[PDB]
Amino acid sequence: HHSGLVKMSHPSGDVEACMVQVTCGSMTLNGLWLDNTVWCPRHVMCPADQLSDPNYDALLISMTNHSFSVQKHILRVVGHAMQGTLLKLTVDVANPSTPAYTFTTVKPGAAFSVLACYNGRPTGTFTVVMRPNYTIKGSFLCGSCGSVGYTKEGSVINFCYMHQMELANGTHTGSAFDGTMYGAFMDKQVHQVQLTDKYCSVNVVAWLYAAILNGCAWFVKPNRTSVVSFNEWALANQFTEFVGTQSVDMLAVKTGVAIEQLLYAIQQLYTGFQGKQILGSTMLEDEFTPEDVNMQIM
Amino acid sequence: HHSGLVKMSHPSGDVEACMVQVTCGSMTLNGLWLDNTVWCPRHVMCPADQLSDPNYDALLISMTNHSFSVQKHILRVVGHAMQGTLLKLTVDVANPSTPAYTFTTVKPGAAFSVLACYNGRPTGTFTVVMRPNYTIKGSFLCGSCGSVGYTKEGSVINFCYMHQMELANGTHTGSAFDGTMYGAFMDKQVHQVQLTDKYCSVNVVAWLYAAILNGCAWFVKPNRTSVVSFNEWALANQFTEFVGTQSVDMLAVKTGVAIEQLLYAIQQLYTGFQGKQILGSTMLEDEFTPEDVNMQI
Ligand SMILES: *[C@H](O)[C@H](C[C@@H]1CCNC1=O)NC(=O)[C@H](CC(C)C)NC(=O)OC1(CC)COCOC1
Ligand SMILES: *[C@H](O)[C@H](C[C@@H]1CCNC1=O)NC(=O)[C@H](CC(C)C)NC(=O)OC1(CC)COCOC1
């Protein structure tokens, strides 16, 4: 039986209307236009020559307002400032289609939608999970910097990601809109090695609950492992700490299966399913959130 | 090395601007507002009483323009007609934000984006492949009917799907905008026979080309299988006919690996990967198209 559990993104129309192109010298990339502000990665300031150790503080000082061209395809710069790894440009027109929005940094295990853009033009959207080593997968090519990641709750878009770089293992990372880089990677063209990744324990729990809701519960036993005990074990076996949420609790109430029975199951299943499948899979899946499962299976 | 091959959907803003809610008596679902026309599934006319064997001809005749209610959230009806499994409702206002569009019927193995909506409100977007048995997977709950699927060529939107139903096995189907149901399923709540699914051969090829581009070419051999022999083999082993395309050919040039080497490879991998993985998988993957791979790698 097909569960209906799929990778689902937020509808992108609200964010499409905020995308612009930003150009500084030879470098061109994407920006986010909210009210009188345009956000973009500060390495737009850097010519290809100096990208391997840029001096951003000096590059900023060398700019004037005319050093930045902002074009909408889908504007006069009247101020420029740097905030961590982002530029905050002030323009003289308020974006007439600005959504209600917040700037909240996301934590590992949380999912968000990405609007991939090139030269200020949206081309595709996908959902990613912020990994425990502060990278994301997804699909990003040359020109994609400034593409944004977001969630939506009610009318309020939460902007959580602005794309900056690809790592040698092909994963990606970027900034929060407070200017910090996820994982503290440097916006320098240099080899940087991401830390070891981990299974997102709370999302594995959610997926097992999706399995139960879908009629697949051969892995459920009476046996349990406490949260506190599971977390001691998680540290030493490449799992995140489990932190419960009202979203997980809803799934436990619906199924009648306790969180702690699934923490025991995870300790038995992460080595393999001994020939069985769970939701068409032979390994544990950690990129569906408790919210995904509540939204899509209930 | 993560390939960067992911399930990607089209930006949905153009289509979001066309979604409305359609209400008829006590039933409510989504509709697509293009110019002066609102498209929605005809079963909005059916009371819960009679979902098993609705008489859509008599239901239509019993309706008047005032039977229908159309609200834009993200309108007065002055005309109603039935086209196959869809209603075509004429409203007095023409949608100002109507994109350039066409209507197409997608074929098995082709990918399209779906804007899932509830009560006229877009809530999510995902990409599906029309399966060889004319069903799709995806995620659709109660209230999702009238959600639409589409591709793009340029800024042109090609509307190809309007969601209608879920089958006993959890898969889904819908209408093309000429009113025909994909796979000729009936818009009634009765058990109906679904053909067995098959691997979409051309997409498996594209997936192996993506593996090669990503530096995973252990399955590659100079052993070849002609398209014709492959096609013969595919009938007895639950695979679709391979049909080359310009898009596949590009991939054979980028990698310098011939189609027939991968056809040969498919025959062997179907019997097993023999301890090895391909792009993190131990089974063949057939929901990534040649166009996906060309665009994403
Ligand atoms: C901005 O559009 C760039 C996006 C990456 C290009 C390929 N895929 C991407 O996601 N970002 C960069 O090019 C970035 C600039 C520095 C932070 C100053 N460098 C980068 O992503 O690094 C490499 C590998 C070390 C990525 O792969 C291509 O070579 C550069
Ligand atoms: C319209 O929004 C409905 C969408 C489905 C409901 C649950 N998931 C869906 O995709 N469509 C229907 O309710 C449909 C109406 C008939 C075509 C007249 N019924 C339906 O999808 O079939 C059932 C039973 C075969 C699927 O299983 C649950 O009950 C409905």
Residue numbers in the entry:
A (entry chain B): -1 to 72, 78 to 301
B (entry chain A): -1 to 72, 78 to 300
Give the published text.
Coronavirus 3CLpro is a cysteine protease that has two N-terminal domains containing two β-barrel chymotrypsin-like folds. The polyproteins are processed by a 3C-like protease [3CLpro or main protease (MPro)] (11 cleavage sites) and a papain-like protease (PLpro) (3 cleavage sites), resulting in 16 mature nonstructural proteins, including an RNA-dependent RNA polymerase (RdRp). X-ray crystallography confirmed the mechanism of action of the inhibitors, which involves formation of a covalent bond between the active site cysteine and the carbonyl carbon of the aldehyde.
Hydrophobic and hydrogen-bonding functionalities were incorporated into the 3CLpro inhibitors to capture additional interactions, and the position of the cyclohexyl moiety was also examined using appropriate congeners. In the current study, a new dipeptidyl series focusing on the design of structural variants in the cap substructure were synthesized and evaluated for their activity against coronavirus 3CLpro.
